[PDB]
Amino acid sequence: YNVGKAEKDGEIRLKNGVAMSKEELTREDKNRLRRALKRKRSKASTNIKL
Amino acid sequence: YQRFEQAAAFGVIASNANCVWIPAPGQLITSALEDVNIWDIKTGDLVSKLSDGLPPGASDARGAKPAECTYLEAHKDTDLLAVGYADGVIKVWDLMSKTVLLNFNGHKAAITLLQFDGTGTRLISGSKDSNIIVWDLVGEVGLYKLRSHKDSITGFWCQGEDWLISTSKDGMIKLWDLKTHQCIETHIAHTGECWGLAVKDDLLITTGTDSQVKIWKLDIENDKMGGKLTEMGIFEKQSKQRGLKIEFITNSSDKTSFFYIQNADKTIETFRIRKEEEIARGLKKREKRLKEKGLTEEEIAKSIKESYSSFILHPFQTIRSLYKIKSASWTTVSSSKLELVLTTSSNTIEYYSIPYEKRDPTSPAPLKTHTIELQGQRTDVRSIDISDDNKLLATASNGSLKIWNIKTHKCIRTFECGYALTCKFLPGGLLVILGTRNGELQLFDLASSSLLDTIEDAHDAAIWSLDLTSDGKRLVTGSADKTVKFWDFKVLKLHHDTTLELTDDILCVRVSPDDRYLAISLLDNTVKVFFLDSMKFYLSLYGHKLPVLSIDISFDSKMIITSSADKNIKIWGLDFGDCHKSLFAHQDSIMNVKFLPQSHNFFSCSKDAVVKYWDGEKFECIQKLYAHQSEVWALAVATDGGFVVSSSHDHSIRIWEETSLKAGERLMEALDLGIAEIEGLEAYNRDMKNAVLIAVNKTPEQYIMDTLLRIRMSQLEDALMVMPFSYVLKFLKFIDTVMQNKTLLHSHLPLICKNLFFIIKFNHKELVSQKNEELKLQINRVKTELRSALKSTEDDLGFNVQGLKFVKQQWNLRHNYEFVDEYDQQEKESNSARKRVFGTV
Amino acid sequence: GHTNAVQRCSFINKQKQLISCGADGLIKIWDCSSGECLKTLDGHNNRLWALSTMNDGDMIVSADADGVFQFWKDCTEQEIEEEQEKAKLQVEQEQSLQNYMSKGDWTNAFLLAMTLDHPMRLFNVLKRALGESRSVIFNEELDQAISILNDEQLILLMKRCRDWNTNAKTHTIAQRTIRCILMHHNIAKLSEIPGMVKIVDAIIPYTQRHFTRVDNLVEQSYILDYALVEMDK
């Protein structure tokens, strides 16, 4: 068993086993997780005048 | 080159913000883009104008458009005005000194609401960024931030130090505890956005997008985990549009309460709160009526609950205005009459007085007592012109013409006209001529203050452009009817002379200063040049992607500029029609370009709200003028060239005048601080029978433990070796202290084990040599409780693995098929068994 | 957008929308202003020759060539009302959950996190409830709450325990929750819950690793004994 992508769309799950639902996350955390997602992927006549 | 600066700005009465009334009908405070205007309602004249400084166009001036005022709030007792701007800046203004006192910057978006506390020492600010920040005036700092809402704060209510209620555009009503900085309750005010919030005693009213208006009782002290806000009932206002603002005013003599619901349309709806005796009288009466109808008591009770709202509120009167309403505020409350003041979107102030007696008002409609309308134009100015003397400025707008004294900035005369498009002064500065969109030509005399002649059929369509010859005896008018008509001035009336019919719609006509060239723009993206005396075709300038909107010819009739909707300014030589240069000047459509007289330098204005100064010879941008908030529609240059006048969509006429420790080293410091405290408290305890820690708000054991966690594991073993032995005894006292606190011990049990065992192993020889009896007891205590914690974790792991194995085993007996033959069983187990794939070399 | 010929067309919602029936058997609801397919209804398997609407299309009747009627009723406002009520309840649950966490009422906050399915908050409830326990398994009130859990909740909780068990920094919270479940539930019932076994299969290998560790930590702790005996000399 390898902890992988969350089965539920609203849920976010990480390799360390930490799971967060999108509802509970604050906005600053959502942006932080989104940025972390980016880096991981990158490694891998009338009208006119008037 | 010389610098252009904003010499004056006028023509704005009420911009996009709220209105603040101050008693002496009294004066009114209203926003004018970046400045604030104080008006005397009785006289209608501007009492004073608040300008921070830094006039646009100066070298020290910023390179972006000024932030407009969004919300005004004044504390009457202290005579302080708080002004919120679109960029998220709060400035505290001294009314008497007319100067800025404080400057708060804590918001990333426009400020939506400002409210002084009762004592006037703290200011609460809500902004479009969804944050509420409470500021300290005497402290000049932001105390704390409330960050639960997920959209613009539409309104909030805080009359008490202890609680705050806030409303936001996400449709949520939230109760805050100012002493804890947290949200206690959350309810959905409306299905969509929630825009209004007014609270009187327990009564609370909020407005959504639709006509539904909710009533909530505010039981602050309920403290049940809920119910502080509970829904009472719903009443429908007549206006189907959203409700923006709600405000309460109480009559001291009669204790009567009234409130309005400022809609997005031209309607303000006023409501009266029924007294308790009126409610009880009404409740009994309707019970008699409904009982007479034969309904059951349970139905009567439910109907009373359904009709709950009707008992408290009474539709009092509706105020209807000609223009859309922007903001409103109660002015005075009395038994005789009720008065309101409002600001429209069309840049005017209206004062409404309501005489009333008992339940209902005396008159069917409110009495409009005062209006401030002279110093502004309702519609955007489409064209401007300056008299030859450079004293009188004519501004033509849809439905009205107003003329201003450039020195006093005051309107002199106002003329009612059609949808005016173009305006120019005739020679002598005594007459004005207009081309309306209805094809009409209107001529005005300033002395008579009356319209002399109207030519109804001057053109079959809009007269987009109009120009005069230098002699002033001839007029050239271009229209959308695809014709140019020449008119003569004979003693004063206009006689049509000649018609020149073109293939497409006409957008601009310009006559050269020497009257030799007539340049005309067409909707097919071409500019044709003709010879005025003979009307012989000369040139067809080509290369604009979108239709040319303005044309202007140099003073020497040599160079001609064309500005088009494709954001390009193209400069041409009239000798041959060759294009000298095409400038990508503005970010939006360029509406007008004018030459500076006796020079080739020219100005340009566009829809991006920027007026740019160019060099007609070097073809470079000299100066960028950021003062307007929206599209700049018209531009005019003085005959002397001293100043330039620009009018924008913001109803503003602006006159521009020419003027470290490493891992291990940190840990040793942590041990010194923590164990000095532990030793001190112990010694203090024995007898009876610091700044760093208090600042961080942690116990000595926690402080040392946190420092251990920050050390990376790759550095930890090297960090521990660097410590002298004297600190190892200190470390061994720290771990002993941790053992009593069982919560910390199990929280970081593996970490504590790894560090302890490494310390003992590394300097085991010195540790055993020491003959300290106290040390021997510490290790004994550290050992025993360390074992129990480790055994406690181990027993749970052992218990579960045996239990979970049993759970797996029992399911197999019930739901696992069994082959008696071993060979058949082996084939099944291979198939059922999990399989994994690996790369192999 | 129709795969086959369109045989019926009728406006609904006044000017706003248009419904069309095709020989393919699909009913498509379009937007007149934008000319785009908003919704597709598939209740037939043959061509449709009849399409009747009443009350501006609030109820739509279509017949198959085979002889099947599909009586469609508009439910946009009904669905919206359900979502509004669900959102209203969800908001109150979130606020109540936050209040309990601040006050530390873990026995209540545990239930809300299970219903709201907030794994991080659920972990914090159990972690800091366990911390108070250090000072039967968790406490009297919260132990009872775990016992009452139904089959669906047990599967959800055990899934979190499986994930938590993988990490050595968070296995301790997982084992005690598993310990609480085994002592307060009928083990006969736990086996028959569908899918509980595969969750159990993943837990055991990680549990043995954690048991191999910790035991070695116990062995290492006897260096203190060897230290004490040397001192006594």
From Swiss-Prot, chain A:
Domain of life of the native organism: Eukaryota
**Transmembrane residues, as ranges?**
none
Q: Where in the cell is it found?
A: Nucleus, Nucleolus
Entry coiled-coil feature ranges: none
The record's function comment reads: Involved in nucleolar processing of pre-18S ribosomal RNA. Required for the early cleavages at sites A0, A1 and A2 during 18S ribosomal pre-RNA processing.
**What does the sequence similarity comment in the record state about its family?**
Belongs to the MPP10 family.
The annotated subunit structure for this chain is:
Component of a heterotrimeric complex containing IMP3, IMP4 and MPP10. Interacts with snoRNA U3. Component of the ribosomal small subunit (SSU) processome composed of at least 40 protein subunits and snoRNA U3. Interacts with the SSU processome subunits EMG1, IMP3, IMP4, KRR1, NOC4/UTP19, NOP1, RPS4A, RPS4B, RPS6A, RPS6B, RPS7A, RPS7B, RPS9A, RPS9B, RPS14A, RPS14B, UTP1-UTP18, UTP20-UTP22 and UTP25.
Protein name from the UniProt record:
U3 small nucleolar RNA-associated protein MPP10
Query: Covered range within the whole protein?
Result: 496 to 593 of 593
From Swiss-Prot, chain B:
The record ties this protein, via Gene3D superfamilies, to: YVTN repeat-like/Quinoprotein amine dehydrogenase (2.130.10.10)
Q: Where are the WD repeats?
A: 64-94, 106-136, 148-177, 189-217, 376-405, 415-445, 458-488, 543-573, 585-615, 627-657
Respond yes or no to whether keyword Nucleus is given for this record.
yes
SUPFAM superfamilies of this UniProt entry?
Nucleoporin domain, WD40 repeat-like
Q: Which GO terms describe its cellular component?
A: 90S preribosome; nucleolus; nucleoplasm; Pwp2p-containing subcomplex of 90S preribosome; small-subunit processome
Q: Where primarily located?
A: nucleus
A GO molecular-function annotation: snoRNA binding
| SMART domains named among the record's database cross-references | WD40
Source organism's superkingdom? Eukaryota
The record's section on Pfam families has: Beta-prop_WDR3_1st, Beta-prop_WDR3_2nd, Utp12
The record's subcellular locations are: Nucleus, Nucleolus
Per UniProt, the keywords (alphabetical) are:
Nucleus, Repeat, Ribonucleoprotein, Ribosome biogenesis, rRNA processing, WD repeat
**Gene Ontology terms: biological process:** endonucleolytic cleavage in 5'-ETS of tricistronic rRNA transcript (SSU-rRNA, 5.8S rRNA, LSU-rRNA); endonucleolytic cleavage in ITS1 to separate SSU-rRNA from 5.8S rRNA and LSU-rRNA from tricistronic rRNA transcript (SSU-rRNA, 5.8S rRNA, LSU-rRNA); endonucleolytic cleavage to generate mature 5'-end of SSU-rRNA from (SSU-rRNA, 5.8S rRNA, LSU-rRNA); maturation of SSU-rRNA; maturation of SSU-rRNA from tricistronic rRNA transcript (SSU-rRNA, 5.8S rRNA, LSU-rRNA)
Q: How does it assemble?
A: Interacts with snoRNA U3. Interacts with MPP10. Component of the ribosomal small subunit (SSU) processome composed of at least 40 protein subunits and snoRNA U3.
Please explain the role this protein plays, according to its UniProt record: Involved in nucleolar processing of pre-18S ribosomal RNA.
Regarding protein family, the annotation reads: Belongs to the WD repeat WDR3/UTP12 family.
Task: Recite the other comments.
Answer: Present with 9620 molecules/cell in log phase SD medium.
- The name on file for this protein is U3 small nucleolar RNA-associated protein 12
Protein source organism: Saccharomyces cerevisiae (strain ATCC 204508 / S288c)
Q: Organism classification, top ranks?
A: Eukaryota, Fungi, Dikarya, Ascomycota, Saccharomycotina
UniProtKB/Swiss-Prot annotation, chain C:
Placement of WD repeats on the sequence = 1-42, 44-82, 92-133
Give the UniProt subcellular location, in the record's own words: Nucleus, Nucleolus
Quote the function comment for this protein: Involved in nucleolar processing of pre-18S ribosomal RNA.
Q: What is this protein called?
A: U3 small nucleolar RNA-associated protein 13
Q: Which residues of the full protein are shown?
A: 573 to 815 of 817
Task: Give the record's subunit note.
Answer: Interacts with snoRNA U3. Interacts with MPP10. Component of the ribosomal small subunit (SSU) processome composed of at least 40 protein subunits and snoRNA U3.
Q: Cite the source lineage.
A: Eukaryota, Fungi, Dikarya, Ascomycota, Saccharomycotina
Q: Miscellaneous notes for this chain?
A: Present with 8070 molecules/cell in log phase SD medium.
Native species: Saccharomyces cerevisiae (strain ATCC 204508 / S288c) (Baker's yeast)
Gene transcribed to yield this protein: UTP13
